[PDB]
Design a protein around this ligand. Sequence first.
Ligand SMILES: Cc1cc(C#N)cc(C)c1Oc1ccnc(NC2CCN(c3ccc(S(N)(=O)=O)cc3)CC2)n1
Ligand SMILES: [Mn+2]
Ligand SMILES: [Mn+2]
Lengths: 554, 400
Amino acid sequence: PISPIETVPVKLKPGMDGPKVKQWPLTEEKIKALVEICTEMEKEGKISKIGPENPYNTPVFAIKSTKWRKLVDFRELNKRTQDFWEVQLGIPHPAGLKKKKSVTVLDVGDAYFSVPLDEDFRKYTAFTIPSINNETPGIRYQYNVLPQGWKGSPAIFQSSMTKILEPFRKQNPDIVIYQYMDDLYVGSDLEIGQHRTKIEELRQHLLRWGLTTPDKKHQKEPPFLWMGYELHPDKWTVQPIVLPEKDSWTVNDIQKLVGKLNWASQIYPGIKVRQLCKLLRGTKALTEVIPLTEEAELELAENREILKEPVHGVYYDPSKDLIAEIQKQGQGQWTYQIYQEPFKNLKTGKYARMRGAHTNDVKQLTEAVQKITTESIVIWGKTPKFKLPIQKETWETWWTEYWQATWIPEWEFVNTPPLVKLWYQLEKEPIVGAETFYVDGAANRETKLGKAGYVTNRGRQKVVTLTDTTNQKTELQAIYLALQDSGLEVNIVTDSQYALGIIQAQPDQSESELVNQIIEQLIKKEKVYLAWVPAHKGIGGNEQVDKLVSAGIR
Amino acid sequence: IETVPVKLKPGMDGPKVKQWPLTEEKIKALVEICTEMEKEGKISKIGPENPYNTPVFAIKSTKWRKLVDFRELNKRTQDFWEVQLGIPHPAGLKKKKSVTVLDVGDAYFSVPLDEDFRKYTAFTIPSINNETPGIRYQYNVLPQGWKGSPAIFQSSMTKILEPFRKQNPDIVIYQYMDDLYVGSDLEIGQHRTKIEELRQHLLRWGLTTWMGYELHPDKWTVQPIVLPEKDSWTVNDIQKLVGKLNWASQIYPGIKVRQLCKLTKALTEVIPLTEEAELELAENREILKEPVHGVYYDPSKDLIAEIQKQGQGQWTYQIYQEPFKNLKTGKYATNDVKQLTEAVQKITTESIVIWGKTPKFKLPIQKETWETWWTEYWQATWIPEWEFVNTPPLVKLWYQ
Ligand SMILES: Cc1cc(C#N)cc(C)c1Oc1ccnc(NC2CCN(c3ccc(S(N)(=O)=O)cc3)CC2)n1
Ligand SMILES: [Mn+2]
Ligand SMILES: [Mn+2]
C-alpha cells in the first residue's frame, strides 16, 4: 500500500535540470522480465505509464536464483538531486539501553515502495523499457513511490516513519520503539499479554498509514542478535569473537584481527592492540605474509586469554550514577571501565593516542578523561565520577604550573598501579654552585653538516659534529651534550624557543630518539634549570658559544 | 509588517554543522523551550528536504535559555548584515563614563523572516544514545544570535529609540546582535535612572529586558609590559629582562637593549646595574606605559585575541589584527574553564564596545575540553570565533 502520509517536497540541485540518459538496448529475457515486473508494480500503483510529453530518462537493468530483480541506475539523477538531512546522527550503544521485560522486532514490508514521492518530482524518475532490438518506442514509466537506488529514499522513508510513530509514541510513553531502516524494535515492561496486544495496536497503526508488517509467532528466544551484539534481558555482549588459529598471518588477516579485537574491547577489559598495529605499518600487499614479533605474539596471547571466557555487560539504570575507572597499561596505552554498581561494567574501553610528537602520563590521562567524558554524554547524557591512578597532589602540582588550561570533573584517586607521576621537575630559579652550560647548535642548510656544542661558566668547551641534521636537531643535541657532560645540578642556557618549549612541557615519552635520550638524562639529574636568551643579540655567554659553534658551515 | 528579502551569495551554500552531544538536562530544557516556540509559531518542525544545520545549546539565574550557534550562517550572511544593511559603530561609546548592556532579543520574535531564507535556520535537538530520531526545527521569525536579525530590525529599533535619543542627545546607544549598548557621562544613579526610562520605551512595542552591573570604558587601560624594579640583579634577571625588552622592540618604536647587553658568566652571579642601563631601563618603562606608535584599527581586517594562563587565577590578553602589533592588552582576574570562559566574554565585550566587532580567540586549551565545558559557564548571547592554540612558554613570561 502507498501510505496516505503527505509527500516530502523534493527539488533538483540549483541550476540543474533532470536526467536525460539514453536507455541501452536490453536482452529479450531482460525485456520479458522487466515488463512482467513493471505490470505487477503498475497494478499496485507504485508506477504509472507515460508518453513522450515527458523528456526525462533513466536506464533500467535486470538480474537473477530464479528471481528477476529490476535494477534502476539513478547515478545521474542522484548527481542532479538536492542533498537531504542525515538519516541518523548515531547508533545506540547497548550500555545506554534500559532494562525492559519484553521485546518484539517488527520488519516493515516493501518500505520505499510503500511511501509516496512528491508529484512535482515524479517526472524525473522516468525510465523506459526498450522494445526488442529498440526498433519500436519503449514502455515509458515514472515512480509514484520512493525508487530503489534513489538519493532521498532513506531520508524520506525514515522521516515519514517518524511522523507516523509520533502519535503512537505520545499515546504510549511507557513503550520504547527504536527506528532503524525498514526495522522497528519494540520494548515494554508489560507482561507477554499486555505487550503482544500493544504490538497489534502498533501493527494496525502502521497499517492505517499504509505500512505492512510480517505476522505473529515469528518472534524469537534470547539472546537477540542486534547490530553486532547479543541482547539478553538483563545483560549484553559482543557477538562471538573467533580469534583465528593461523600459522602464517597476512596483512588482511592482521587487519581483520585488529577490527575484531577493537570490537571486543567494548566489553572485554585489557584488550591491547598496539603491537599488532605496529605490524600493519608501511606499504605491504593485502595477501603479503607478516611475521609476528615477540611483542605481537605476547599481545595476541594476552588477548586470547581475555577472550577465553565470555564477559558480559549490564544495562543502564538512570536512577544511579556512572563511575568511570582508568588504568595505565603501558606507554600510550590506557584501559577504562564504566559501571554504576562495583564491577558490574556497563561497558569497557581502550585509549591510545599521541596528540602531537611529545607527551607525559598526566597529559595522557587528562586526554583519556576527556575521551570518556564525551562518550558518557553521548551514551548516558551525563558525565561520570572518575577513579584515577594519580594523586590529587600530583594533579594539582601539574595543572597549576602548566600554561594550558584544564578542568576534569568529579574524580578520586584510586591506588591502582602503575600510578601516574611526573618523572622529573625543572627548577624554578637558577641553581647556585651548579655549572651554567651555554648551549648552541648551528647546522648548514646545504651541506647538512651539524655543529652542536657548549661553553660553561667553568671554562669547559665541547664542539661536536653531526651528519644530516636540521637546525632543530642540533639545538637539541646541544642540550643532550650539556646533559651528558654535566653533574647532578645543572643550569642550561639556550636560544632555541623550540627546544625550551619541548622541555618546559615536561615530556616523559617522545617520537624523536634525541628527546627520549634527553628525557632519560633529565630523569637522572637532581636539579635542572633551563633559561632562554635571544640569539645574535650579543649575550655574555651565548655569543661565545656561537663563535665555536658557527665556526665552519653557515 | 512585511518580510525583508535575504540572500547569502549565488554561489555560497547554507550551513551544515554537526550538533555537539548534549546532557539530559539540556535536551529536556530545550524540548520545553522549542515546544512553546512552535505553539507560539516562532519555529516549525521540518523535514529531510532541509539539509542544513546550526547547533543549539541551553544556558542560564534559574531559567534555561536557548543559545543557537549562528557562526557559520553569520559568516555566510556577511554581505546582508555588513554592507546591504550594516549598523554603524559610534566612536563615542568607548569614551562614555558608564555603559549598560540590555538584552533586546525578544523584539526579533515579533518580526517574520523571509520565507525563502528560513531553510538556513534549521537546528536539531539530539537524542540520548540515539534511540529517538532527533527533533528538527526551523525559524519563522527573526532568530536570536543571527547577525541578520539586528540588520532587519534596525529600522524598527530607530523608531523606538527616536524619542529617548531626542530627549537625551548626550546618551549613546549601540546595537550589537541581541543587545543594546547604552553609554552616558552621567552620575551612576542618574545613568541607572536613564536606563530605567529606556526600558519602558522598549516595554511599549514589546521588550521586557566577568563584568559588573555596567561597563566603564573610560576607566579601561592597557596593561603595560612591566620591567621589574630591583636593587639586586643577577645574570639570569638581566637575561630575562633583555629577552623581554628585545621582544617588545619588535612592537614599541624606541626600545633599546644595548646598555644592558653590555653585561660567559654563571646565571646565579650578581652583576651591578650601570648608569646607561639604569637610564635605558627607566626610558623603556615610559615607552611601554604609553600606547603603541604606528598600530591602528583597519576595519577591513579581522580582530585576533590571545590569552595566556598566568596561574593563581590570573589571565593576560592582547588584541591585534597584525601579529604582536597590539591594539589593546589587558588582564583578567574557580576552575581553569570557568575562568577562561569568563575572560573570553570580557575580551569580546570590550572588543564590541571599542571596534564594533568580535575577535577570533586563540584558546590555550585542548579543543575537546573546551567544546565539552564552555556552555556550563557561558552566559552571553553571542559566540566569538575560536581556534585552539599552544601558548609559547616565552610569551607568557613577556606579558608577566
Ligand atoms: C536499540 C534497540 C535494539 C533492540 C533489539 N534487539 C531493541 C530495542 C527496544 C532497542 O531500543 C532500546 C531503547 C531503549 N532501551 C532498550 N533496551 C533494550 C535492551 C535489551 N532488552 C531485551 C529484553 C528482553 C530480551 S528476551 N525477551 O529476548 O529475553 C532481550 C533483550 C530490550 C530493551 N532498547
Ligand atoms: Mn641554542
Ligand atoms: Mn642556533
